[PDB]
Amino acid sequence: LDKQIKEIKEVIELPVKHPELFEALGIAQPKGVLLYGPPGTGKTLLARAVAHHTDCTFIRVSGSELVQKFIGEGARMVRELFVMAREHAPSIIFMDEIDSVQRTMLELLNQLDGFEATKNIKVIMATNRIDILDSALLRPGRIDRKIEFPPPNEEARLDILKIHSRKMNLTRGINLRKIAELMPGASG
Amino acid sequence: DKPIRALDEGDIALLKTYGQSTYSRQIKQVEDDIQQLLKKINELTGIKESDTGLAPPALWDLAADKQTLQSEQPLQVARCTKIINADSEDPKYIINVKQFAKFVVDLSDQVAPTDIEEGMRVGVDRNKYQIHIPLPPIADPTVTMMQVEEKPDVTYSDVGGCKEQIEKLREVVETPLLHPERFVNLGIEPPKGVLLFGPPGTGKTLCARAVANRTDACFIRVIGSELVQKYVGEGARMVRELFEMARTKKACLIFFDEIDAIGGARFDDGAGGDNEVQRTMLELINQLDGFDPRGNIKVLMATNRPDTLDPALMRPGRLDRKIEFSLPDLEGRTHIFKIHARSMSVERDIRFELLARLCPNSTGAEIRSVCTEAGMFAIRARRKIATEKDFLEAVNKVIKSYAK
Amino acid sequence: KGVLMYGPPGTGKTLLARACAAQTKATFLKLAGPQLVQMFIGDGAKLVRDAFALAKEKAPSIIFIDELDAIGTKRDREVQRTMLELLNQLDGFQPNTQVKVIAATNRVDILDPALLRSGRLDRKIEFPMPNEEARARIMQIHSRKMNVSPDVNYEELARCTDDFNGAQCKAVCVEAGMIALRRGATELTHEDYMEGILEVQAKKKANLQYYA
Amino acid sequence: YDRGVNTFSPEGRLFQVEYAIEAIKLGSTAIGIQTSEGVCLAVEKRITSPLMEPSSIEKIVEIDAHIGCAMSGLIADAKTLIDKARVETQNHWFTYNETMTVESVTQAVSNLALQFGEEDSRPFGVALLFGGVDEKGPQLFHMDPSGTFVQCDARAIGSASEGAQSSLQEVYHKSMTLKEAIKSSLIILKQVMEEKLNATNIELATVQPGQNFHMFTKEELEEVIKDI
Amino acid sequence: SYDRAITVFSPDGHLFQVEYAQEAVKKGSTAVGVRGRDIVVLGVEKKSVAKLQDERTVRKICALDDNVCMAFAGLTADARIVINRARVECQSHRLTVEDPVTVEYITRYIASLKQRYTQSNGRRPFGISALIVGFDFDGTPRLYQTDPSGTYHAWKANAIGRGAKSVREFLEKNYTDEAIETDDLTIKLVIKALLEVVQSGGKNIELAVMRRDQSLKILNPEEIEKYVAEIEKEKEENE
Amino acid sequence: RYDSRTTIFSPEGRLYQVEYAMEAIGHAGTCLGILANDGVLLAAERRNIHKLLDEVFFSEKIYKLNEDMACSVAGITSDANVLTNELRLIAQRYLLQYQEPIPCEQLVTALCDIKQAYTQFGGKRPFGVSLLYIGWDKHYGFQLYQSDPSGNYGGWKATCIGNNSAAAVSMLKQDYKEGEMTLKSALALAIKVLNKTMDVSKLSAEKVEIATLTRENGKTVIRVLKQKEVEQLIKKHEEEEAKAEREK
Amino acid sequence: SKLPLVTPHTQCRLKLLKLERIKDYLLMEEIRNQEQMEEERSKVDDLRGTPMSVGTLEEIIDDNHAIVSTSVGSEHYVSILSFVDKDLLEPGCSVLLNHKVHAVIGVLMDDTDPLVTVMKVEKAPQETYADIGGLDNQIQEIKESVELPLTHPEYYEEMGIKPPKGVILYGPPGTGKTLLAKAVANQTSATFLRVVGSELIQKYLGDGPKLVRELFRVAEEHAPSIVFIDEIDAIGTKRGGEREIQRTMLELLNQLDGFDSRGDVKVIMATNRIETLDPALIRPGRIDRKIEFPLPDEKTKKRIFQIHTSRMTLADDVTLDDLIMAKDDLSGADIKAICTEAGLMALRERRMKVTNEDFKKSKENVLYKKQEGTP
C-alpha cells in the first residue's frame, strides 16, 4: 500500500516538518486523521511507522478500553491522555477500532474541538467497518480526510511476503509471484 | 481535474518565500531573536522567588520565638485506651500514637487522672510519652465547615405570605431555646423535628436562613448530597460525628436541605442500587430518635418531595411537625413585592397590588427575579431610579416568556 | 437466645429495648446497623466479633441491634461479609455462652434468608399499630406530666385517632401542649387534643372525585 | 406504572389518564358562564400568525342553534368530539323530532370519551364547555377527558385556567345578568392572556333563552372593545 | 411515561410521538403557497435533480381534482399514498353524492385520515405536510395546510419548517392586506419567496398556478427564469 | 434506543428501520440500469460464482414478467421472490380489468405503495429489496425505473444499486452518454462499470447476468445474454483497454 | 506575563517598527548592569535551622499551638512561631516545620489538587470580542448579566439589585456559544473555570455531586471567577443512574443559589437542546437569563470570513457575498473548516494564495459531510 503513506505524511508528517507553510498561508493546522479499511492490514503498522519518522511520542489505545461500558472513567480518562501528551510535545495520539458510551463520545468531540495545535499534537483514530457513527465524526475541526486501506493487490501481496521473506531461507527456485496469486482478496 | 501529489522539499524552500520576500526574512529573524532574548532575560533575572513569605516584619521574631523553640516540648498526638487502674495510685494508661505505635504510659504530675477519660485524643511528650495535655476530639474535617459559623443577612421580615408557617416554625425551633420557662412550667416537652415541604422556589431555604440568623445558638447546615460518599459506610460515620459535634454545643440546630437526596424510601426489588445511601439514611433515623436520647438538638428539614421520604424518617418524634408551603396568594404576592422592592431604588408610587394580581401562581422566586429584571430594565437605560414601567415590562418578560 | 422486634415505625420497639436496658441491671450493648458497615475490608467483621467478645467478657450481657436491616439486607459484598460474621457470632461454636441479643427492624422483608432463622432469633415479636384501648393508655402515659383538664375522654381520642401509631399519639399530646401555649392557656382541655389530632392525622388529601 | 390505561396505580388512580388531564393545561384557556339572562362562552386566541384565517381555529363551534360549545385541547380530538356531538344531536332530532337537551348531549358525547381502555385506545386530550338554552332554561356544562361532566354556573378551562377560575369565583354569583358576566370574563381574559383585547386575539359566543340561535359574535365585539 | 408508544401521554400531557412526526416534516424541504387576488400560486424548490435522475418522476405537484392539487413535503411514499387517497375520495364523492365536491370536504377528509392513522398503535402516522388550494369557495380562492398531527387550518399564505424559518417570516413582514395585484403580482410574490428560499437558480424550481376560475396551470422553466430575472431587476432598481 | 419498531418516531425524526433496510441493499448486489438508446438493458453480477451452484433457471438475478417488462433483483431473496410474484399478479389484474398492458410507472408506483403500507403498520417489516425494471408502453415508451424499500420509485437515465454503488454512479456521471447512446455503447459502459466496481481483472462471464429489451423488433422482445456473447464483450473490453495502453 | 500584540498581522514595516520597539525595550531590560554594580534574615532563618520539613496541619488549638501531621502520617502537637501568617494557616494546608522540634515556621505555596489545577483553565487570552462576528444581542445581554456585574457592581450596589446568579446559553452547535463566554473571561479579569457536563457524570456513588461542590469551592477562593458548564443537558433533561443524576442536578441548584452565600462567582451554562432540560434549569427564578444563539445570517457570516480570512493571502476574484447567499446553512465552526479546507485546497493547488474557486471547492466538501434522510 502506497497511497496511505502519502496522505498520512501530508496530514501528519508534513504538519510536523514545515509549520511555517501553514502560518504563512494563514490556516489553522490540520487536527485529526481517520482511517478506513479492514482491521489492521497496515492500520497500526502505518501509525507506528510515521511516529518513528517524526520521532514524536506515540500513544496506543485499543478500542476495548474505549468502551469500558460501565461509565468507567470515559469522562476524564480522555483528558488524562491528552494532558500527558501536551506535556511530552510533540506527540502523536493513536486509537484503533472505534467501532468496538455516547457521553464520552461527546467528551472527545469537545476536546477535539478545544485543544490547541500549538504543540504538533494530532489524533489518528482508526476503524475497521463502515459504521453510521463514522460518517458523523467527519466534522469541522475534528478530521480532515478519508484515507482508505484496500485489500492488497497481487504484486502488493508479494511485497508483503518479501517483507518477512528476508529472514526465511529458500530452495533453489522459490517463485513468490506464483504463490502470491493464490489468495485473491486476502488481507495483509 | 488531474491527479496530483504532495509538495517536494525542493519546492517548499521557494514556495514559502517566492512572493513573500519583502520583509519575511527580517520579520522572522526579529521574532525568533525576540523569543530567545526573552528566555535570556528570564534566566538572567534568575528563578522568581517562590518564597511563601512570613508575617509582616514589625510583628514577629522577638527573643520569645527562640525561647519557646528551646524550651517547649514537641508533644506527640495519640489515642488513650482502657485505663488500667489496677492499683489506683498510678493507674497506667495505654495510648496509640496513630501511624507510629502503642504504649503503656503514665501522666505528667501536672495533669490529674480525673482529667483523663477513655480515648480522649491525648497528646504526649516525645521522650517517655507521658500524658502531658488533653486535646479536643478530632471532628472530621468535611464535617467542620458544615458548621455555618456566620449568620445570613435575612430576617423573618424578608419572608412574606408565610406568616403562619414562620409562626409555627418559631414556635417549634426558636421559642423553646429563647423561652424554655414557658414549656416546663406548663409541663410539656416541646417538639424537636420539623419538615418543610412545598413546590420548588416556595421559600423554604429562606426560612432556614432566617432561622439561622435569629438562632443565637449553634447552627449547622446540611445539603442532602453532602452525606453521599463513595466509600461504604462513610456517610453514616459522617452523620455520627455530625450529631456528636452538635451534642458538644449548649443546644444546637441542625438543618438538612433537600433531604430527598438520601431520604428515599427503602426498596429491594432492584437487588442493589442505592442501599449504600439507605444505610446512611438509617444511621440518620437512629440518630434522631433511638437509644441515647438526642438531647437539645433541634432538626430543621426542608425538601421538595415529602411523599418520597421513608416513613420511618417521616415518623413524628424525628419530624415532629410538618409545615406546608404553598404558592403565594394575592396578599402573599403583594407582601413579597413589598419585601423585595423595598431595598431597590424605585419611586414610592408603584401599584404593587396591580403587579401581584397581574402575577399568576408564579412562585416567590419569580417575584424576586421579576424585581431584579425590572432593575435590569432600568439599568439598560442607565436610569438611577427604576420605574413602574420597568416592573411591568419585567412581568411580561419573565412570566410570559416562560408561559409562551 | 435471640429476640427480634419488628413492626411499623412508631409502635415503640426502641422504647421497649430502652426499658429492657433500664430494668435488667445487666451489661447492655446498644448499636445500630450502620455502626457496623465501615469501609475497610474486614473492619465490620472485627467490630461484630469484638463486640461479641466484650459481651462475653462482661458475662451476663445483652446486645441490642437497632435497624438491623442496615446489615441485615438480603443476600456490596462487604456488608454481606459483615452480616455473615454476625450470624456466625450469633450461632457460635459453644453457642451464645450467656449473651442475649435483641434486634429491632421496621422492614422484615429485607432481612429474609438466614438472619430470621429460628436458631439465631428464637422469638419474633410483632409490634402492631396501637389498639384503641392501647391508644387511650398511650395518651394517658404522655399526658401524665402535662397537667391536662380532667374532663377529657381519652376513649374519644382513641376513636378519633384511627391508624395512629404510638409516636403519632405522643406527637398528638405534644401538639395539644403547644396549642395550649398558643392560646396561652393555664391548662389544656379536650378541644386542644382535638386540634392536635387534626394537625397530626394526615395531609387530608385533595378533592377525591376530580381525580383520574 | 405508565404503560397503559388498563393498569391500576398503587393508590387506585391511573397514571395514564391523569396525564390526559395534564394535556388540558397545554391548551388555550376558555371561559364559560351560565346566567339567567343567557349563556356565554369566551375563548382566547393568542394570534399565531397574521396569515392565518382567525376563524379557522375551531375552539368556538356550534353543534346546534339552541346550544353552544367551546374547546381547550388538541384541536384534532377536539374536532372529533365536535363531530360526534353534531351527529348525536342530529340523530336525536331525526328520531324524536325535537332538540337534544344539552345534558343529554354531554352524557352521550361522554360514551365516546369512555373508549380509552374499555372496548375490546387513549383518552382525548380535550376538555370542553357546553352552553345550552332549552327545556331547563340556560345551562352551562363542563366535561373532561376522564369522562366526568358537571353542570356549571361558570367555568374556566385551559392554560392559566386556575387564576381565571379563582378570580371568577371571587366575582361571579349565580344571579347575575348576562352582560356583567361577559364583562367579568372579558376583564379576566384581558388580564391573563396577552394585552388589550380585540377580535384578533379573543373570541366570544353567547346564546340566550329568547334567542336560541347565533351564539357566535362577529365584529359586534366592537362594543366590547369600546366598553372594556 | 415516555415517548416509546403512540398512544401514551407524557406525564405533563404531551404526545412526543406526534411532535416527532411534525419534526420529521420539519426536516422536509421548502413548501410555500399563497392565494392572490383570484389565483392560488405555489412554487416547488430544492428538487436538485442531479443529471442522471429525471425530473419527470419527481412529481413536483399532483392534482387531486381540477380545483385542488398537492405535493407534500417529507416522505414521498406517504405523500403518494395520501395523494391516491385524496384523489379517490374526491372523485368518488363527486360521482356518488347527489351534489359535487368542494375543497372543504376533502380538507376534512385528509385531516381525518391523518388523525385516524395517528390514533392507534401498530400504525405509523404520515410524516408529511401539504398546503391545500381550493377554487370553489363559491368561486373564491382559499388556502389550507395539513399536518401529521391530523391538523389543518386556513391561511392567506402558509409555509412549513425548512421554508418557514426564513420564507414565512419574510412573508409575514411583506404580506400586504391588499391581495397581490393580479396573478402577475401573485407570481411576483411567489418568486420573491423563492428568492428568500435557498438557491433560486432555476435548475429545479418549478411552479403551478391555479386561478380559482380556470383550472390548474403548470409553469415552464423559461417563464420561471424570466420572472426570477424580473424580480432581480426590481430589486436592482430598489436602491 | 429508538430503532426497535418501524412504527415509532425518534427524537430526531428519522426512521432507523428504513435506513437499516437501505443499508441492507447497501451490500445486496451491484445491479445497474444502463443509459441507452434503441434498446434498454440491465446488468447484474452474482455473488454466487461457484463450481457447484447449478443456476438451473439459467437466471437468478433477472426475472421477466411481460412481453415488454423485465426486472433485475438485488436484496433479500425471499422478499425478492414474493415481490416479483406480486408484480406478476398486479400485471395480471391490470390486464384482466383493462385488457391493456399496464403503464410501467403505474405498476412500479403500485408496488411502492404496497411496500410503504408494509412498512407503515405494526408487526410488519420493510421489504429489504431494491429491484430495477424496464418497459415500453404507449405513454412514454422506453422507461427505466428503480424502487426502494421505503416505497419510493426512482426514475433514472442510468442508475446502479447494491454494493459499491458510489463508484458506479460517479463513473456513470463521468462516462455519461446522451441521445445517440446506442445499445452497444451501453454494453461497453456496463462492461467498464462492472469491471471497476468488481475487484476482478478480466471480468469472467459467469459472474455477470445481463438482459435487455429491443424495439427494432417493435412487436417488442426481451433477451437474456448467454455466455458466449458476454465473453465476446469481455474480449472487446480487453482489446479496448489494450489499445488505451497503446495510446501512451 | 506576556508581551503586547502587534497591531497589523500583515507583512509590513509598521510591524517591523513595533517589533523593533519591543526589541529596544527588551534590550534596555537586559539585568547585567545591576548585576555588575540582615537582622531579619539572620535571626529567623537561624530559628528555622536547615533542613526544613513540610507537614500537613489540620488544627489550630491556640493562636500559638496546633496539631501538625507529617508525610509518614504521625501527628504532632506543636507550637507556632510569631512569623507564621495566622490567616494563611488553615486545615488541609501544607506547613513548614523545624527539623528538630517540629515547630510551625511558616506557610507554603499550595501545590496540589491536580484535577482543579486542570479546572482553572488559562486566562483564555486567545479569545477576544474582536474574534466574534456580530452577536450583538447576545453580547449586550451577556454584558448585562455577566461582564457588568463583575466590572461595575456600582449600579447594582446603588440601585439595590442582587445581580443575576446564572445564565444559560442555547443554540445549534458551532454557533459560537463557548467562544463568547471564553471571550468574556478575557474581557473581564475574572478567572475562567470550564467544565463539560458529560465529564461530571462519575462512576462512583457520590463523586459526581462532590465535583460540583469541588468546582464551586474552587470558584470561591479565586473570588472574581467564571464557571462554564458546557453541554449542560447531560445532567439536566427529564426523567441506578436515574437517582444520582437527579442528586447531581440538585447539587447545582444548591450551589447556583440555595443556602449560605455565593460570593461573586458567576455561572454560565451552554447546551444545544434547551427544549429538553429540566424546568428547574428553565426555572426563571433559578436561572435569570437564557440567551439565544441563532444560526448566523448574511451579515454575521460576512464578518466570520473577515475574521477567519484575515490571515491568508487572497486573490481579487474572491466573492464572499456569493458564498453567503444560500441560507444560514452552516455555523461559524463550519466556516472555520471553510477557511481551513480552502487553505488546504489552495495549498493542494501549489499556490500560497487562495482564490474564489478554492472557496467553492471549500464549500462543497463541507456540504457532503452532512447526513442523508427523507428522500
Ligand SMILES: Nc1ncnc2c1ncn2[C@@H]1O[C@H](COP(=O)(O)OP(=O)(O)OP(=O)(O)O)[C@@H](O)[C@H]1O
Ligand atoms: N407502646 C408504647 N408506649 C409508650 N410510648 C410508645 C409506645 N409506642 C411508641 N411510643 C412512643 O414512640 C416514641 C419513639 O418511637 P419508638 O422508636 O420507640 O418506636 P418504633 O416503632 O420502634 O420506631 P423506630 O423503629 O423508628 O425506632 C417514644 O417517645 C414513645 O413515647
Ligand SMILES: Nc1ncnc2c1ncn2[C@@H]1O[C@H](COP(=O)(O)OP(=O)(O)O)[C@@H](O)[C@H]1O
Ligand atoms: N501491508 C502490510 N505489509 C506487511 N505487513 C503487514 C501489512 N499489513 C499488516 N501487516 C502485518 O500486521 C501487523 C501489524 O498490525 P496491523 O495489522 O497493521 O494492525 P492491527 O494491529 O490493528 O492488526 C504486522 O505484524 C504486519 O506483519
Ligand SMILES: Nc1ncnc2c1ncn2[C@@H]1O[C@H](COP(=O)(O)OP(=O)(O)O)[C@@H](O)[C@H]1O
Ligand atoms: N414567601 C416568600 N417571602 C419572601 N421571599 C421569597 C418567598 N418565597 C420565595 N422568595 C424568594 O425566592 C427565593 C426562594 O428560595 P427557596 O425557595 O428558599 O429555595 P429552595 O428551593 O432551597 O427552597 C428566596 O431567595 C426569596 O428571596
Ligand SMILES: Nc1ncnc2c1ncn2[C@@H]1O[C@H](COP(=O)(O)OP(=O)(O)O)[C@@H](O)[C@H]1O
Ligand atoms: N459568531 C462567531 N464569531 C466568531 N467565531 C465563531 C462564531 N461562530 C462560530 N465561530 C467559530 O466556532 C468556534 C466556537 O464554537 P462553539 O459554538 O463555541 O462550540 P459549541 O457549539 O460546542 O459551544 C470558534 O472556534 C469560532 O472560530
Ligand SMILES: [Mg+2]
Ligand atoms: Mg428504632
